[model samples]
Structure formats: structure tokens, C-alpha cells
Target: LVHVASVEKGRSYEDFQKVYNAIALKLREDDEYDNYIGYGPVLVRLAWHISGTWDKHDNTGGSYGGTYRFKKEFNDPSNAGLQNGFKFLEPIHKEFPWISSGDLFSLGGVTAVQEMQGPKIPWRCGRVDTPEDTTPDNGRLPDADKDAGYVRTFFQRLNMNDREVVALMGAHALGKTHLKNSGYEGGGANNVFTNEFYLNLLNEDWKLEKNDANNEQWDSKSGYMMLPTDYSLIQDPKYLSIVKEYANDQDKFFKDFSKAFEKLLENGITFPKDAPSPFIFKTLEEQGL
Candidate 1:
């Protein structure tokens, strides 16, 4: 049950940086995707879903396994709309066939976040692919129709604390949920990453309404939306405190999110004492590309 960090045969920072650049470049070029929201958000969600399967108790599922390449994990009902993200990565995978599935999947998220003007997520290059039988079963991900208590309890299996939960939910700001994909819908989708998810939770006058999917979501007159689990952040006292904090301070939210996200991706793997330090990638803008 132990997964060690194994850098792909002689692959170093520059090797992975080439992979990162490819993902970032495609994210910029593919401007017509998902109503011009582009591939950034779906890429982030793909990474999250792939990593989110981790169960800390047994380490049965996680980004370390890269099991999403198999049918079971790919076709999971919870992963409905992520096919777009997978398709987007297919070309990159073909170009750099050596990168492991887990590494490519997780790196896609990091590249998407940075290109979208989010924080720098220091990423490691390892995550050898596990076998098909290693894919975690469906239902490991959280449901959207739940409450704050459900959100807190569900993430406990992933070993995330209250702040981590709130910070990670900041990703909700990146993309809108599709009813066909997750049984919930409606949000002003944006490709950029920010703390606006927290701001909207605190500032919007949301009313509970059933979407065309017949699922309940909080809608605002300004045309933004929040899933039951998303609105639960403000509903719960402790979650509300962090939500408010993140809403007020963007820098703190970015820092905390970077740490939590890196931890989320790195779970269920052991790094050797001499393992190389994580690489902080420069965005396309930063590189003047």
C-alpha cells in the first residue's frame, strides 16, 4: 500500500516544465471551449476529481494511482462532464508519452490554475501509474445536494480540515456546474481563479430554487448560483468564519489554497528524504510567452 515518489526515468524539472508549457499553451489556444470559459476550469475539476478519490485510512484511491485512465474511474457518474478535460489532455499525452497519467492529470490542474491567474502550486514530478484494478470505485466523491455537516463529514475521509475545505471550495469560483454532468446547474462561469466564490456566498441574496434538472440550488438575481454544499459554507458557523475571512483577504486565501491543494494532490504518497523540492512553474504571462 506504499507508493513512493519515482521520477519518470531521468525526467527532471525542465522535462516536466515542457509538459506544463504544453498544457498552458493549449489552455490559451483553446479559447472556444465550454462557451469560451475555456478548458481551465474543467482541467482543475479533473485534477480534483482524480485526486479527490483518496481515502486516507487505507490509501485505497488517490492521485498517486492515476487510475482514472481506466473505464471504471473515467465513466464514474460523478465524473460525467470531465470527459472534456480528458479529451483536452489527450493531445498532450500523445506528444509526451512518458509522463504518467497521475502526473499529467494533476499537472493539468496546476497549469490551469496558474494560467488563469491563480496561485503558484508547487508541483512534484512522480506519481507512477497503478494498475486498472487499483482504480477506486464510484461514490468516493462528495455529492452537491448536501449540507455543511455533510460537507465537513465527507471531507474528513480525505483528511481536510475546515479551512482546507473552505479554501478548496474557492475553486467553485472557476467553473459552473452542468445539470447533465452533476445534477445541478447555473452559475456565472469564469475561467479565472479567485476568492469570489466566498464573496458571492456572503454577499449574494440567494433563494433556494429547483433548476431544470429538478435539483435545488441557491440562485441570485445577478445570475450566479451555489450548490447546496457551496451555500452550506455560510450556513455553518465555523465554515462561515473562514468563508468570510477568504472573502475579505484574497492574498491569504491564495496562500492557504496553494498549500491545501498541493497537500490534496500529494496525499497517499511517500517522498524520500532526498526527493527534489517541489517546482514552482512560471505562467505563460510570467514567461512573456
Candidate 2:
């Protein structure tokens, strides 16, 4: 299961940085998306949706396959609203035709995270584009309808523990779920990436209500919403503890999320211990952009 680092013929950190800059600039340019929320959140969601398919038991579905470039994975019902993120990256792929599909898709997420001012996620390359036959079938991703046990069980397939699951879900801070997209809606501050997701969860007075989609969701006056599974984090004692901790310390949440997100992106791809160290890209701020 170990995937050794393989530089794409002549590519290196500088090459990837150029790709990152392209994505960052594009994110800045594409301001009309999602009613001005921009493309960053959807890009991260696309990245997670791509990686979330991994099954730790047999290591079948994950970002490693890159089969999302194929029709089957692209058409998965769970991936309904992600076409925006994919289309946004399409030009970048064409412009940087040398990057592999898996690497490009995953890197899009890394770039989105950093551009939005999230933590520095150390990322490694070497996920070659797997064949169409390797694409996982539609039911592998988690459901928003589920409870704590379901959340725990679903991510177990990804080999994520309670803490890891909680930390990764902190990504809810960035995007809102369109009812048409996932039968759920809204996580506060949909345009920015921060620990506000946990903060809202702990502080908001949320009530269960059926939206226009008729699915039960936790709605808050702050123009935010949480799925049953998100609410589960606070309702369950173990998860609630981590939620409270992350809600209180943005720095801790960023650190934990960086580690968990890197792990999420790296799932199903094994790397040799001696593989090249993960790259920490210079953020736009660092580059004085």
C-alpha cells in the first residue's frame, strides 16, 4: 500500500507552486460563483468528496485513483454540485497539462485551503491517474442524514478515528450545503475557512426543521445550518469534547485540521518512509500577493 514519491518526469515544487498560483489567482478572479462566495469552498469540497471515497479495509476508493475524471465518478449523485469546482479546475489542468489527474485534483484542494488562509498542509505528490475500472461505485461517501454512530462507522472506512473525524469535519466551516446538492443546508461563514463552524455549533440556538427539501436540518438565525451528523458532534459526549476544544482554540483547530486533511488526502496512498518530505507551499500572503 506504500506509494513512493515519483516526480512527474521534470516536475518539482516550483512547478507545483506555479499551479498553486494559477488556482489562487483564479479563485480570486472567479468572484461571481455561489453568489459571490467564490470557488474556494466548492474546490475544497470537491477535494474531500474525491478523497472521501477511500475504503481502508481494501483500499479501494480514494483520491489515489483519480478516476473522478471518468464519467461514472463524475456522475455520482453524491457529487452533484461539484461540477463547479471541477469546471473551475479544468482550465488549470489544460494550462498545466503535465500534472496527473489525482495530483491536480488534490492539489486544487491544497491551494484552496491555503488561499483561504487555512493552515499550511504539508502535501506529497505521486497519485497517478488510475484507470476508469478503478472508479468506486456511488454509495461509498457518507450520508448527511446519519447520527454519531453512522459518522463513526462511515469514516472508519476511511480509517479515521473519532478525533480525526471530528477534526476533518471542521472543514464544514468553509462551505454551505445546497439543499439541491445534499438535502442539507448552510454552515456559517460559507466563504471563509476558520474554526467558526465549531463555534457556531457550540453557541448557536439551533432547532430541527424541514427545509424546502423536507429533510431535517439544524437551522440557526445566524444564517447557518448543520446536518444531523454535524449536530451529532455536540450531542455525543466524546465528540462534543473535541468540538468544544476546537471551538475555543482556533490555532489548535487549524493544527489538527491540517494534519487530518493531509491524512485524508493521503489515504489509500502509501508512501515510503524515505520518500521526499511533504511540501509546504508558500501562501499568497507569504509571497506578498
Candidate 3:
């Protein structure tokens, strides 16, 4: 898939850095949501949901089109509660009209993860905004209540392997699932990014229970829950091994996560061989926070 460059004319790294700062500032100011879980988790989820749509065979969906801006994709049942992230980026987009929707949405996730102290996701800008017609139909994203086979098959469409899939799901460490949003509830720390997800998975005494939404979720007294898909990792021998590895070594998890996430974000978008390499943005902490 060879895509012609879609770089917004005259913009450079400084411009994207400004956008990152705006997102970071708001993340700090908007501390009222979900016990101060803030907007970072949902923003990262938004980026995943947007990019997760990509089918490597045809390069149809994915963040490259930014078709999530379209009503069809915006209203996806699986995408409920992501409107907050979109709305958060609205002002930034308004301030920088030249930036494409794909770039803004994907970059928002990168900013959120970095600002949340997750990992340095190297990002490249070439995603061009396309028409609403380009929006892939619903039902492309994974279901939460499925088994290991389903999880494995689902991500294969995105060309992700076992290691990448496990690493990417580590983002579960950042946010809790909402019963209203996904028929699942409870997860990890709302603010911090850590390997705690794997830790909780490995350590917690989990029981299956119905939430207010009547959906079965793995619950623990620690005020955390896991979707069937998340639990599938530990149930599958191959995935469980990697899960244990990530749980045991935070640095290894972070390193693997950074690579997996960058791969996930870049899925389906084609960069020419001569295109500029990925950019590693500085976090607020590195900037003297």
C-alpha cells in the first residue's frame, strides 16, 4: 500500500508538539471525570478504536482515513464514551485547521499515553482525511465477551501477532471499562500507566459476575474487572506466557508496548521508503514537569 504523502503543508514537528501540549494541558485541567481518571485513557482507546478498524488485506479502515469523524463511525455502539476524546480534540483541531483528522486523533492517543507516562510512541504524520463514504461499516472491532480463538482471529485482520496483541492489550492498565459503554466494568488505575494490568491479572482472585448491565465480567474486590477478551490472554497458554513476562518486567512491557502501539497506530497506512522516520515526542515530565 503506497500512499502519497498527506503532510499538512508548512507544518513541522513544533506544530505537532504544540498540539500535544494543548492535549496535555487539558488532561491536567480536566480532573473531574471518573474520579480523576481524566481523559487520557479514553483518548488512547479512541485512537485504538479508530486504528483498530484497519484490514491489512485491503487497507480499508484504520486511522489513516479518520472516518471516525463521520456520523456512522462516531455513533458506533462499541465507540460509545469516546465522544469525550473527540470533543476534547475539537478545540485543538479548530486551532489548527490544517491538521488532518487522522493525524489529530492518532496524535491525541500518542500524547495521552506519553503524558500519562506510558511509553514514547514514535509517530509519523501522513494520514489523510477521507470522505464519509470511506468509513468502514460497524462490527469490525473486537467483542469483549469472546474467547482466545476469537481474540486471536480478530487481531489477525490487523496483522498483529501474539506478542503484539498481548502488548497492545496492556493498555487496559490505563482505564476501567464502563458497564453502560461496553457491558463491562472495572479495570486499572484511571490516571497512571503501568504493568499493573498484568499484575492484577496474575495476582487477583477473580470471579465471574453480572454487572448492572447483566454482562458477565471477571470481578475482584480490588474494584477491578476484566473483559472476557482480557481474561483470554491468561487462559491461552501462548498469550499467558507473554502476559506473565510483561507482568514480571515493567521495562520489558513498556518497551514491547511502545513498539506494538506504534505498529498498531501505523497499521494500514503506507509510508514511502523515503518518508521521514517516526518522531519520538517529549513528555511533559521530560520537558521539566
Candidate 4:
């Protein structure tokens, strides 16, 4: 049976809430990066990469081990441009050195999504640090140039089934693909953190065109973009079904995201029923009141 306890031995919900508020405040200050898209997508990518290292078969390489702070995982090519995310979180980690890098990075994701008006993701603790040798080989991260079959096959190595893959990509609804970040560029412009990606996808007159950089962007009259993989959602027979589902119902998207995000964060480790359910921390704006 699954249950949640009060905070960990040395941690309290209030202390963790303070940490949440701190990261949230920092997020507000980072509005100039990524064309003022803020620290969102990279942070989300950081959280994903940190958590994505998990391998369910052996349970040795998950978010339970926040080894990304080490040089090996941080240097992974897939993580090429995410130093910004790490630098962004540095101060808060400095302010609270007791929090594990694993927890800080993973919890950062929970805070970012909720503060941006997404779902309440239940997070947990108990991630430990491993030596550099434990780091998974690089290239495990997804590629932007991939196709439907490629994306689907890639996620399988990480144990994400079809529906889970769809829910995870809903994250693209939050930030655009930067040319520098992924050789691919542009997606949502205004609705950087809301379910608006679904809204625009259903309502855009997207024209497929290659940029001068030879990259793809599903340009739309509304000035948004959808990469081939992103556009394939509505174009491909199987993926289109999930795209239409998320398009029609926002609440369902939220619910599914909550479950899948929780699972992603909890990968590679087993939790006792008595372990605390991760807090649904308040945003900085709320704590100020």
C-alpha cells in the first residue's frame, strides 16, 4: 500500500516550502534568458534529465541518485545547453546545503510546473549520491530530429509506455525548442507554461518549412512553432489520437501529467508506504502574502 508520512528525519514541509519559494523567486528573476522564456524549459529539461537516468530493471540509476551534479552526467551531450539550469539553481542550493542535489533538482521541476499553473505533482525524498562511474552512458536523452517511431522507441528504453510518452511531451506546451538548445527552434511563444500548447495546436494554420539554418519549425500564422515530432502528434494516426484527446480536455491532461510526472520522478527506487508524499509547495508569490 502507498501512503505519505510527515517530512523526512531532518526535513519539514515548512522548510521545504521555504526552498520552493526561493526557487520560485529566482524563476521570476530569470525572465531574460531564452528570449525571456525564463528558466522554465531548461529547468524542466534538467529535472527530466536528472530523473530520466533511471533504469527500472536494476533500479541503480534513477533520480534516487542525483549524480547529475557530478561532472559526468552534467557533461552529457544531450545536456549540452543545460548549464544554465544548473547555474540558475546554484544559489538556492547554496542557501540550503542540506538538501540533496537529487531532491533540489527534482523538486525544482515540481515547483516550476505548479507555479506556472500546472498540476500538483507529488514528489518524494531518498535519492542518494553515486560515484561518477554509476552515471549512465550519454545519448540516452531524446533527439530533436527523431520521428514518431524513433521517439516512441527511444522512450521505451526509459520505460515510458505510449500514453506516458504523450503526457511527457505535453511539456513542450511549456517552452520552445531553441536552435542553440536542440538544433531545432521555436514552438509556443506566449503560453510558455500553460496547457495552451494543446489549444494552439488545434487552432494553428501551421506551414511546414525549413529555417535558413536547415532546421524544422511548423510555422503558424499565430507565430508559434511545432517541430516535426511535435507536429507529428496531430499528423500521425496514432499520435494524433492522443493530441486530439489532450486538445479536447485540459483537466484530463492535468490529471495524466500529474500521474506520469510523479512516476518519472519516482523512477529507479521503491518507496515505503510510510515515506512522505512530496509536498505540493506554494509559489513565491503565494508565500509573500
Tell me the whole-model lDDT of each prediction, alpha carbons only: 0.93, 0.87, 0.88, 0.76
Which scores greater on TM-score, model 1 or model 4?
A: 1
Clashing pairs in 4: 123-278
What's the lDDT for residue 142 in model 3? 92
Q: Decide which is better by TM-score, 1 or 3.
A: 1
Choose the strongest candidate by TM-score: 1
TM-score of 1: 0.99
Predicted candidate 3 versus true structure: per-residue lDDT over 164-258, tens digit per residue: 99999999888787767887766656678889889989999999888787788898887788889999999999999999999999999999999
Comparing candidate 1 with candidate 2, which one achieves the higher lDDT?
A: 1
lDDT of predicted model 4: 0.76
Comparing 2 and 4 by TM-score, which wins?
A: 2
Tens digits of per-residue lDDT for model 2 on 1-289? 4444556777778988888889999999999898788999899989898999988777888888688989999999999999998999999999999898888889999999989989989988888887889899998888888899999988888888998999999988886787777777655556678898888899988889987777899988767888899999998999999999999899999999999999999998877676667889998778988
Question: How good is model 4 by TM-score?
Answer: 0.90
Task: Give the Cα RMSD of candidate 3.
Answer: 1.3
List the candidate 4 regions with Cα displacement exceeding 4 Å.
1-9, 285-288
Which whole-number lDDT from 0 to 100 does residue 232 have in model 1?
A: 95
After superposition, the stretches of candidate 2 with alpha carbons farther than 4 Å from their true spots are: 1-5
lDDT per residue as tens, model 4, 1-289: 1212223458778888878888878888778887777886778878998888666566555676678888888898778788998999999999988887778898888888877878888877766665677777776677666578888877777789877888888988876666765676665555345566667778989898888679767889877888777766676678778877888888998999899988888777666677776667776655663
Error of 1 at 117 (Å): 0.3
Best by lDDT: 1
